[PDB]
Each structure stands twice: as structure tokens, then as C-alpha cells.
Amino acid sequence: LRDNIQGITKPAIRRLARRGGVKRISGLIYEETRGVLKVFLENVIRDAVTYTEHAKRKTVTAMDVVYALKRQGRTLYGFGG
Amino acid sequence: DNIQGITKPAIRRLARRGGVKRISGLIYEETRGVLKVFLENVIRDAVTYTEHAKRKTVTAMDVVYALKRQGRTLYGFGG
Amino acid sequence: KESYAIYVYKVLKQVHPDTGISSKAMSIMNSFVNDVFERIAGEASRLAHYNKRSTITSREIQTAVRLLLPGELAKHAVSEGTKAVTKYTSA
Amino acid sequence: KTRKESYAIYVYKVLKQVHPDTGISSKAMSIMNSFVNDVFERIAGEASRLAHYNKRSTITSREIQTAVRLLLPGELAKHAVSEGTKAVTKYTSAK
Amino acid sequence: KTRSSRAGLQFPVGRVHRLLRKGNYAERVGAGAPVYLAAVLEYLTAEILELAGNAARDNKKTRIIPRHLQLAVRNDEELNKLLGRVTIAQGGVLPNIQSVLLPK
Amino acid sequence: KTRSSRAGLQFPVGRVHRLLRKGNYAERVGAGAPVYLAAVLEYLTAEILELAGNAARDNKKTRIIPRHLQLAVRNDEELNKLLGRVTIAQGGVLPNIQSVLLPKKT
Amino acid sequence: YRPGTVALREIRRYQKSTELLIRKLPFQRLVREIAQDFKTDLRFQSSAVMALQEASEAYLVALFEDTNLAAIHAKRVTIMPKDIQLARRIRGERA
Amino acid sequence: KKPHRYRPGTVALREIRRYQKSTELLIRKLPFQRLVREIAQDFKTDLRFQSSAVMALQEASEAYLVALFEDTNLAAIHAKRVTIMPKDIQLARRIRGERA
DNA sequence: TGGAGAATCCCGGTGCCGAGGCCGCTCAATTGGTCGTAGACAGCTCTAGCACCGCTTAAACGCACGTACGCGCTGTCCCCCGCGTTTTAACCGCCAAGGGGATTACTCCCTAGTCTCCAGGCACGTGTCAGATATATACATCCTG
DNA sequence: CAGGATGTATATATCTGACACGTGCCTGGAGACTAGGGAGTAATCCCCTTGGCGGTTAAAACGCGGGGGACAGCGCGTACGTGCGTTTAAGCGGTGCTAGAGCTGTCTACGACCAATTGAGCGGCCTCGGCACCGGGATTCTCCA
């Protein structure tokens, strides 16, 4: 179909690493970083879809996602209410 | 004084199990320090577990739940 | 003062009928089964608490084992459990 | 129609208590709301855990100050048990 | 009158009581437990809000933004110790640059 | 009759039922929830002594030491991902040496 | 051509900022096309997809900061994906 | 030479194989007992200990140290080295979340 | 060294929409009473922890030396950084439509709770054989040749 | 390549105490029975999610040139490593003991259950000013001659 994961771009990755505080970045880290973000999205989104499916819902509200990052202890604030 | 009782050949044996050939001379005392920090945290949770239920001794159950609180849960001693 | 000795012992006799188990390994086994018990029951309790459904039943614990175990073992355990509950509701 | 239960105006009162010239935001109000019931969940669940250790159905002030021993750093925890004992003595001294 | 005024508190003894009642953490409760819970949440909210007010007042700000509470938590050691595994929404990142990457 | 025999399972459904009743998870418990509990735990321990019996079989012993438990958990990738944060008592560490650790040129 | 200092200049530009870094519509199409696997014709909410945004940003800058310290231990200012491999090994995601 | 002398590294390989083979006790347990009693009366005196308790903390410390030492070892190979430095274990403690 | 310019900080006006504040209604909070049931405490039982004592003995301790690995230096090459033009596609504001979340209303099932009977599960006793230990032998390494 | 030289896998002789089986007494497990509210199911309505197009314009893609970092190699210093003799106190056996954890029993007060009572609290709607945004000047520092 399409590329989608290549929809995010390399200057976005330089911004993200620039918040982390680097100077020099290799050009081959991008595909591997995209794969890391893909499998992190797998590990949250699977809990998200079964949490949606449990309560007769086909629409993901914010609160079960707060529970999804709560599940592996990476809890997020400002959306649980 | 007795923190130094955890001896240098024991750290060598621990390194041989962990997977190391070559060790540095400055390793062992700071390893004893960070190990001491680990038993500091574990022993604080164990002593407040002991003191909460009115006993003046520490069994194995409460230190298992102390490591459960710390996320380092251990089998073979109940719980 | 109860334990999980003889159910797991005859489970071992059913799977591997010609082996034994020491007391330390049985303590490992007992601590394992009660550990996964309180983990899966705490997730079931959270699942009941979350969507104001104050009754715990088969669909909620099915979702709880969807969350707990990873994929392949999750589908295998879920399928075996629903065939067990279908056998129970038939009997 | 239904009652969206929150903790907003109460820490608005404590905010006007401590700093009389500062405002709040709704987004900041959401981190405050999520933070306070998150600490409520851990403190009450761990109090339940200590209730189940001692095989008692009765829960009180003492396992919750034991939970302040557990899930808090030390000096903040001993300030917290001082505050909790002060508040509960002010309550229990009310004739 | 009410139990908040009887305990000299702002956090609700009655609502914290009712939440912990139907949150079925235990079968029965004493009287001092919701008072204690209201006290400790009052202290933690007051401490974090005091640090947020300080972080607002050195940045000449009067409306509290998530950047200010991120400054409140991440620049204080026991708040790092207790708020360790969280994510702060729209809060930025603590500035920390290694001296190796600094020029000359 | 027993609900374990009625469901064809092995763990006691009534014991699981009252332990989950008095472990205050909820004040209402459904019918098939302890049946589902017993089924999933018996499946899990079936794999555990499956791998433990195999590890004892390739170690020419018939009594299982927790070393066989350790090679049971740490060799299955899915089960290691599940329970890998749990320390197994007197389990030891697997033989794992890197290729740049042993001497070269044979 | 002005070398080097513009990197630290945008370091200081991005460490004070609070805005979002991944552009949101590629991420929106990404979560649509990965949620097409689990359950088709599935629906979302805006607050939920910003929650995935915030979680992904926090995890990724934690990863990049640990990568920076791996590179400093490597006596390099250039980051290389074996530092990513070490940082994922540290969290136990690999082993 | 006339006396046999094994070259260094080979007997290190022998010890890592010999110690990954077995599950025998590693840290000597009565100095550990003196250590926990030292910490115990450092906090609050006249405290007693159980044997199963003291082997529980001993085995927990064994597990924490072998995991930390394997991680700092692989960090030392990552630093293009075969020796562990203290800065390797500083990176291990910082990166694993135990320090910051 | 001196000077050009590129961004950052500060400075001023403004306009807005986000926060403050007041208001009316109602649902949870509170006042009061009861009854029983875990909790508090005391008295007894007894287990498990505590603690000296010697003896053989594995294991820690200490030192020599040497080697091969840690670490600084240097040189080279090409990999990203940084700039600029062209291209890309995303923001926002707008308008349409409907699927599905959220709430209400009814009914019945099944699960809480008591009572009663009973058998499986657990404390206790046991005799025995898998596995720990022992010593002689093949074998699979490594080191100088 | 290659020979000898040692640590280690294997092999049976033997011994012991944990491991699994047997007994029965007993407290949960199950059958029977009642009842009531939690939730299944259905119907209504309305937020709110998705789709989509066009002007604007900020941001991405690609090319080019170079200089600084990544890496290969090298050379020299000493740090543990290996192996010997040396010194230490762990470890098993054995026993006295005493201190506090656990079981039993009984009174009691306090907290769940129920009804009734009402204002704290929470959505709804109005108002203003703090701060983001547009625009412009003062201030730093960085790199070139």
C-alpha cells in the first residue's frame, strides 16, 4: 500500500535527538530507530486495542491508553481525568 | 570495617560468574559501596515490615514482599 | 497451612510419568503458581474496577490473560481455557 | 448530566492559601488531578497489601504510616508522618 | 459542620472515605485512615505546588504551565526518587549538557 | 462431584474460588472465572514441567533441581519475556561467553 | 559556512521548548495503519493519539539521552546504532 | 619452560565455564550475616534474624550482582575493551535507572 | 587583534480566549441509632534462634614477575554538517454526515448467604533408593617445539 | 603441524537422608435452598469522529563542499594474573538456653447498615486581562582578514 512509517522524517529524528542533547548523528540510525519506535508502538497498542475491545468499544478514548502506559510502568499524566 | 569483609577473591568469583576476565583494582570498594546501598534499601523495607506487625525478628516472608515492592521478587522462601 | 503440592505433583505425573521433584524445586513451583495467581487476580480486579462492572467473570478474566501473557502462549492458554469452560458448561 | 468528579477547586483553595498571586491552568489542573488520584491509588493499594499480610479486616492510621515508610523517600516521609499525626490529633481532640 | 473543618483540612475526609469504601481495598476501615490520607495528599500537593510557585516566580509567570511543574519535580532529588517512572505531558526536558560536547 | 472433575481440570476450582473471594478482588464472583483460572494455571505448569522434564532428561537426572527450572525459563524466549524480571533461587547463570572473549587462532 | 556552534545553538533552542516534535499527521496515519492489523475499521480520539505522541516522545528522548552517555563512554561525539542496541539491552527489551 | 605456566586468559575462560556450569554458593555467608546485623543495629538495635531470611537477602544480592556485572561486562566490550572500569559500572547504574 | 552579520533577548502594543467568579440545583455528606463481630489482651506452649568451643582445613592473604593489554599519539580518509534552492505536503478553517458512546428503563437471572453432610487434603510416620561422594582411567585441551 | 602435560568427563562402589507413599482425622467443599439487585438487553439522542477541499506557507528533499571526527596502526608503561608459600578463620558437630512467635479464649467498642436531612460541590453562563503574537531595536559572539 504505502510507506507510513517513512511518513516521519529525518529532521524529526534530528529534533528528537536534539532534545536529548547530541552533536553528531550517523545516517544509518534512522531505520533502526523507526523499528524501535514501531515495536514500542506494538507493545502499547496491543494493550490499547484489547482494552478497547473489552468494553464494547470500537473507539479508543484517552483513558485506556493512560492505562496502557500504566501497564508497563511508563505512566502518563494529564489525561486520566 | 566489616563491609570490607566482603573480600576481593569473592568479587573475583562473582566476576567470573558474571562473565569477566580482566578486572580493575578500583572496582571492589565502590562495588561494596553500591552493594551496601542495595542492602540499605532492602533492609529499610524489611525492618519497617518487621516493626509493623509487632515482631522483634525478621522472617523470610516480609523480605520477599520487600523485594516484591522493589520489583526484585524471589522464589523459594515462601510468598 | 495449605500448599499446592499434590495437584502439581500429579500434573507432573501426567506430563512426565517417570520423574521426581525435590523440595526446593517444589517451593519454586509453589511460589511461581501463587505469584501468577495474585498477578492475574490483581489485573482482573483492576479490570472490574475500571468500567464500573462489579462482577468478575469469564470475559473479564479472558481479557486479563490477553494482557498478561505474550502472544502465542496467550492464544494457546485462552483457547484451552475456553474449551475447558465449554466442557464445564456442557457438564 | 452525570457528575464528573474531580479535585480541582480544593487545590485551588490550597493554592490561594500558599501563594495568593498565582493562577492555574486547565491542563495543569489535569496533571494535578491525575497526580493526586495516582498517589491515592498506590497508597491505598499498598495499605490493602499490608492489610492482607497481617490477615486483618481492620485498616487504620498505622499501616498507612507504614505505607509512608514504604513508598516515600525518608525525610519527606518523616515530615509526612509528622503532618499526619498533627492532623489526626487535631481531629481526635475535637470534643 | 464537616470533617474537613473538624480536622482543619481542605481535602475531603468524606469523599476520600467513600472512594476507599467502594474501592474495596479492604472489608472495613477505621476512622483515622481517611484523615491520614487527606493529610498526606495535602502535604504532597502543597509541596509540589510550592515548588511550582517558586519555578513560576523566578520565570516571572503567574499562570501555572506544565513546564513549571516539570521544573518542580525534575530539579529536586526526592521528587526524582518518588516520581521516577512517570511521563509529564507537555513538560519539556531538564537541561543537561555534557562538558565533552561543549566546545574547547 | 468436584468441579475440577466436572471441567476435566486439575487445580481445585472451589479453593481458587474462595481464595479469590477472600483476596478482596471483587465482592461479586462469576461462575466460570475460577474454571478459567484453573485452566490457565494448569496450562502454565504443564509447560514448566514439560521443559523441566526435558532439561532433566538431557542432564541424566530424574529429580528436578531448580537448575532445570532455570534452563526451563531462560531458554524459552516468550516465557523469558513474560517472567524474566523474576529471580529464580539457586538457578545459576547460563553458559554464555562472547566470541571476542575466548582467544583467537584456536 | 558557519561550523559547529549552530548545533549547540539548536540544542539550546530545543531544550527550553515545550512544543511537539514528530509532525502529528504522519504519526496519525501510522497509528491508523498499525491498528488496521488488530481490528479493522477502528476509531480513535484526539486526546488518545496525543497521549501516544507524548509517550513516544518521552521514551525516545530517554533513549537518545542514554545513547549520548553511551557515545561519551565510547569517546565519540557520533552516535551509532550499537549504542541503541546497548540501551535496549539495558532495559531488558533485548535480553 | 621447565615449570608449566598457563598463559593468562585461558584459565579465566576455565573459571567462567566452571562458574556458569554450577549453582554453588558464591559470596561467603557469615561476613554477609555480620553485614546484615551491622546494618540492622545501625537502624534499630536488638533485632533478630531468620536463616531463611538471611539466605533470601543473600540470594537476592547474588542475583543483583551477577546481572549488574554481566551488564557492565558487555559495556566493557562496548568500550572496545576487555577490562571493566569503574566508569562502566557508573554507566550501568545510571542507564539501568538505579541512580537516575 | 578589528569588524560584519546571524541569531537571541528585550521591548511595546493588542486582542482573545482561557481562566476566574458567581449562580442555581441536587446528590452525596452528615446526623443519629443499633448489633455483632473482628480486635485487644492475657495466659500458656514451645519452637527456633542465639551463643560458646575446638579441630581439621578450605580458603583467604601476600608477593614476585612478566606480559600483554590500557592508553596516549598520529595520520588518513571520508562522513556528516551546514547552507541553499526547489519541492513537499501539512495547518486551519470551513462544511456534512452518521456511527457509536452515553444514558435510561425494565426483568430475571445467578450469585451472596445459611444450613447440612461429607471426603479430600494435610500433619505424621516410614524405608529406600536417586543422587552426592570417591578414585582410577581416557580424553580433550594448551604451550613450547 | 606436533608431543607431552595436566584438568576434566566417565565409570562403578557405596551410603544416606530426603522423597514419596500410607493413615486418618478434620475443616473446607459441595448440595440444597432463598432473594434481590447487577447487569443483560433494548431504545433514544447527541456529541464527536471522520472525510474532504483549498489557500497559505512552513518545512522536507536533494545537491555540494569541506574539515573534523572515526578508525587503523603504533609504541610504551605497568596492572593485574598466575602461581608459589603463608596465615586465617569459616564450617561441622554438639549442646544449653531463653525469648518471643503462635494458639486459645473472652470482653468490648466501633464501624457497617439504614433512614432523613441538607448544604458543599459541580456544571452553566458571564466577564476581563495575561500572555501569545506581530513588529521592531538593543545585545552577544562567531568567524573572516
Author numbering:
A (entry chain B): 23 to 103
B (entry chain F): 25 to 103
C (entry chain D): 32 to 122
D (entry chain H): 29 to 123
E (entry chain G): 16 to 119
F (entry chain C): 16 to 121
G (entry chain A): 42 to 136
H (entry chain E): 37 to 136
What's the publication's text?
Unlike other chromatin remodelers, INO80 preferentially mobilizes hexasomes, which can form during transcription. Here, we report cryogenic-electron microscopy (cryo-EM) structures of endogenously purified S. cerevisiae INO80 bound to a hexasome and a nucleosome. We group subunits of the INO80 complex into four modules: Rvb module (Rvb1/Rvb2), Arp8 module (Arp8/Arp4/Actin/Ies4 and Taf14), Ino80 module (Ino80/Ies2) and Arp5 module (Arp5/Ies6).
All Ino80ATPase locations on hexasomes are different than on nucleosomes, which are near SHL-6 or SHL-7 (12-14). The pause could represent the reorientation of Ino80ATPase from SHL-6/−7 towards SHL-2 and add a step that slows remodeling of nucleosomes compared to hexasomes.
